[PDB]
Design a protein around this ligand. Structure first.
Ligand SMILES: *[C@@H]1O[C@H](CO)[C@@H](O[C@@H]2O[C@H](CO)[C@@H](O[C@@H]3O[C@H](CO)[C@@H](O)[C@H](O[C@H]4O[C@H](CO)[C@@H](O)[C@H](O)[C@@H]4O[C@H]4O[C@H](CO)[C@@H](O)[C@H](O)[C@@H]4O)[C@@H]3O)[C@H](O)[C@H]2NC(C)=O)[C@H](O)[C@H]1NC(C)=O
Ligand SMILES: Cc1cc2nc3c(=O)[nH]c(=O)nc-3n(C[C@H](O)[C@H](O)[C@H](O)COP(=O)(O)OP(=O)(O)OC[C@H]3O[C@@H](n4cnc5c(N)ncnc54)[C@H](O)[C@@H]3O)c2cc1C
Ligand SMILES: *[C@@H]1O[C@H](CO)[C@@H](O)[C@H](O)[C@H]1NC(C)=O
Ligand SMILES: *[C@@H]1O[C@H](CO)[C@@H](O)[C@H](O)[C@H]1NC(C)=O
Ligand SMILES: *[C@@H]1O[C@H](CO)[C@@H](O)[C@H](O)[C@H]1NC(C)=O
Ligand SMILES: *[C@@H]1O[C@H](CO)[C@@H](O)[C@H](O)[C@H]1NC(C)=O
Length: 581
């Protein structure tokens, strides 16, 4: 079936011209591929490092098997630099295959706070990037299924208004066929008790309180990976071509005009085993935020100071790779009594004051008075290059927290036999970078530094959120199911205070694999790399369409907006295509 249509032979595409070349077959790349080829005169070639894996078996198809694939070849596992917070290397899990990280994520489907997306337009000057517009496309990509009696009974709430049911991404309640755990509702009572909302539909634009949510899976529980949703139904499209197992090394730029123009791409597996394919219209980079920026740097698009020592000629000087925003994750795990047995996941989207509790006052002084200092510090560390532009982003976050009271922490609960909390501070103030460390793209020698916890609010923010998760595990209704803390367990005193948690955390956290921002959609003056249409500044025919582009973090799981985002850019591209005649 699909597997026979994928090209695995580099020579099947070398020297050919297609209208669009999409570097990366992941969530954004396949969504775009399928959108463009809807127009039969538009020929697309997707070049993906991995191959087809959606039908491989449960390791891919069962969301309940989440994490088993880490380390296999469907895991790019990029390692960070030796992190300064703990002097360790972290591994960035990243799907390698058709569907990219949709092949390995947990499938959570939720949406951000509308003030957040709105800020893309008002603060970042991205005309058209507002909630109304973005939520519109999001509903357009969605094929939500309403929860049944048992699912509602368990704690599910679905506002129909907030969901599309004619889309492409099959989404619905995960259901292992087993009974749901009483613990979901027990968590809802514990938060209700402290005045936190519950059962608010997270796809509505106000992700707050504790709610259950849909997952990208068909009713049959099979993963709605991007390849299964947009490629599988469409692989027979003669204008859709996908080369597997090859690496896009860099964009070919013709420089005999007023502006360099992206002409095609170079791909291969090794220095000396490369091939060139060309594009009539444009090169769309969709290799993920850890790699689209390096593709640009290998190409002469990036800062002269990085490019120059590597022997690369800088064609366009832009702050490629700066502004990386990823989250830190910490676990709190507690054993439960047999009474709490069953399946179920829920998340508390806690606001600033709910995260910090008694420290809200303190936490607030910081937000209010450290903005500039923090901005100079992150700039000094290479996370960004312009303090003022950085400041504006901080002021934007102060605004969302202070005036829109968006969710600052995410406490994700996993039951299925334990009460396991994965907690992450959703709005990091730290800025990291990603820069190539060599001129050969196939050496894959790059420095990825998310600078986790180099900003004090982030550390405290993560310490408070995790401490919160220990607190609710054993509060109110939760208490009846609690049967002893497993992790940290003996590694951290139960009665640990915020500082103790602060000290513990840099050594017991993992990246959240939600890195965005390395090719930021913001005006060039503000440190942006791409315009409101995802076009790289100063180059013709080059777009960056993936997680590299959101200029901010979001209080949600990103798939909903990333599919919305790929759809909106595809429209943009369609318009430019009909113009390019
Ligand atoms: C990540 O790794 C890096 C290194 O790769 C870590 O950074 C290094 O950290 C060490 C300390 O952890 C630091 O070494 C100190 O340098 C000081 C110079 O500013 C020295 O004064 C200091 O020496 C004192 O302590 C030593 C260790 O106990 C003694 O051997 C020494 O004789 C000195 O002792 C005097 O002072 C101490 C306390 O002030 C006192 O207890 C003594 O009685 C006496 O009065 C160390 O040599 C390095 O400079 C750091 N940087 C570099 C580049 O190496 C980093 O901290 C790691 N991060 C994490 C999270 O672990
Ligand atoms: C472990 C994990 C958990 C996650 N959890 C969630 C969750 O529960 N819910 C949520 O909403 N989202 C989650 N996400 C994030 C979401 O999956 C990603 O944000 C989204 O997939 C990013 O889309 P993208 O198009 O930027 O890139 P990707 O999907 O990463 O795709 C990039 C594609 O490029 C291919 N590629 C890489 N380098 C090259 C190269 N040189 N050439 C060609 N192809 C290349 C990759 O192999 C991949 O297929 C998770 C991510 C991970 C890794
Ligand atoms: C469904 O969501 C929309 C939010 O835009 C709201 O206006 C509508 O009344 C919601 N209903 C409930 C009961 O949440
Ligand atoms: C979905 O599509 C079908 C048929 O083409 C239509 O009947 C239905 O109204 C659509 N739903 C919405 C709300 O767009
Ligand atoms: C949060 O607490 C701060 C003071 O600590 C207060 O100024 C603010 O009004 C509080 N509430 C919300 C909902 O922001
Ligand atoms: C720094 O950013 C500010 C705020 O966007 C902008 O006005 C200014 O032009 C930037 N400085 C440089 C040198 O780009």
């Amino acid at each position: 079936g699909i597997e026979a249509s994928l090209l695995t032979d580099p020579k099947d595409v070398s020297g050919r011209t297609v209208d669009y070349i999409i570097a990366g077959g992941g969530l954004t790349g396949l969504t775009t591929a399928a959108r463009l080829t809807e127009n039969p005169n538009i020929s697309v070639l997707v070049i993906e490092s991995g191959s087809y894996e959606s039908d491989r078996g449960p390791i891919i198809e069962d969301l309940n098997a989440y994490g088993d694939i880490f380390g296999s070849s469907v895991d790019h596992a990029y390692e960070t630099v030796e992190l300064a917070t703990n002097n360790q290397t972290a591994l960035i899990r990243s799907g390698n295959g058709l569907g990219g990280s949709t092949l390995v994520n947990g499938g959570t489907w939720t949406r951000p706070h509308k003030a957040q997306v709105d800020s893309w337009e008002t603060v970042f000057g991205n005309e058209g990037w507002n909630w109304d517009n973005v939520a519109a496309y999001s509903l357009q990509a969605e094929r939500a299924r309403a929860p049944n009696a048992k699912q509602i009974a368990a704690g599910h709430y679905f506002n129909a208004s907030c969901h599309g049911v004619n889309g492409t991404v099959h989404a619905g309640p995960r259901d292992t066929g087993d009974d749901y755990s009483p613990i979901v509702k027990a968590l809802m009572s514990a938060v209700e008790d402290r005045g936190v909302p519950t059962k608010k539909d997270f796809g509505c634009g106000d992700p707050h309180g504790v709610s259950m949510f849909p997952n990208t899976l068909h009713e049959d529980q099979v993963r709605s990976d991007a390849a299964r949703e947009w490629l599988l139904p469409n692989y027979q499209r003669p204008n859709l071509q996908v080369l597997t197992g090859q690496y896009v090394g860099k964009v070919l730029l013709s420089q005999n005009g007023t502006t360099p123009r992206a002409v095609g791409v170079e791909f291969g597996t090794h220095k000396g085993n490369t091939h060139n394919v060309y594009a009539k219209h444009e090169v769309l980079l969709a290799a993920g935020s850890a790699v689209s920026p390096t593709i640009l740097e290998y190409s002469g698009i990036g800062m002269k100071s990085i490019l120059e020592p590597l022997g690369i000629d800088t064609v366009v000087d832009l702050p490629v790779g700066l502004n990386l925003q990823d989250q830190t994750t910490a676990t709190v795990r507690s054993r439960i009594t047999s009474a709490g047995a069953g399946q179920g996941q829920a998340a508390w989207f806690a606001t600033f004051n709910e995260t910090f509790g008694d420290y809200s006052e303190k936490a607030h002084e910081l937000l209010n008075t450290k903005l500039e200092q923090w901005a100079e510090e992150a700039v000094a560390r290479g996370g960004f290059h312009n303090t003022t532009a950085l400041l504006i982003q901080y002021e934007n976050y102060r605004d969302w927290i202070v005036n829109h009271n968006v969710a600052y922490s995410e406490l994700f609960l996993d039951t299925a036999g334990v009460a396991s909390f994965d907690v992450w501070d959703l709005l990091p103030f730290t800025r990291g970078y990603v820069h190539i460390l060599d001129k050969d793209p196939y050496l894959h020698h790059f420095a990825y530094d998310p600078q986790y916890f180099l900003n004090e609010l982030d550390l405290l923010g993560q310490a408070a959120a995790t401490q919160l998760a220990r607190n609710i595990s054993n509060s109110g209704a939760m208490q009846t199911y609690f049967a002893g803390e497993t992790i940290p367990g003996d590694n951290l005193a139960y009665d640990a205070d915020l500082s103790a948690w602060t000290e513990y955390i840099p050594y017991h956290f993992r990246p959240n694999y939600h890195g965005v921002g390395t090719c930021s959609m913001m005006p060039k003056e503000m440190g942006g790399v791409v315009d409101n249409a995802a076009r790289v500044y100063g180059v013709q025919g080059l777009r960056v369409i993936d997680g590299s582009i959101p200029p901010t973090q979001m209080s949600s799981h990103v798939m909903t907006v990333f599919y919305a985002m790929a759809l909106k850019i595809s429209d943009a591209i369609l318009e430019d295509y009909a113009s390019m005649q």
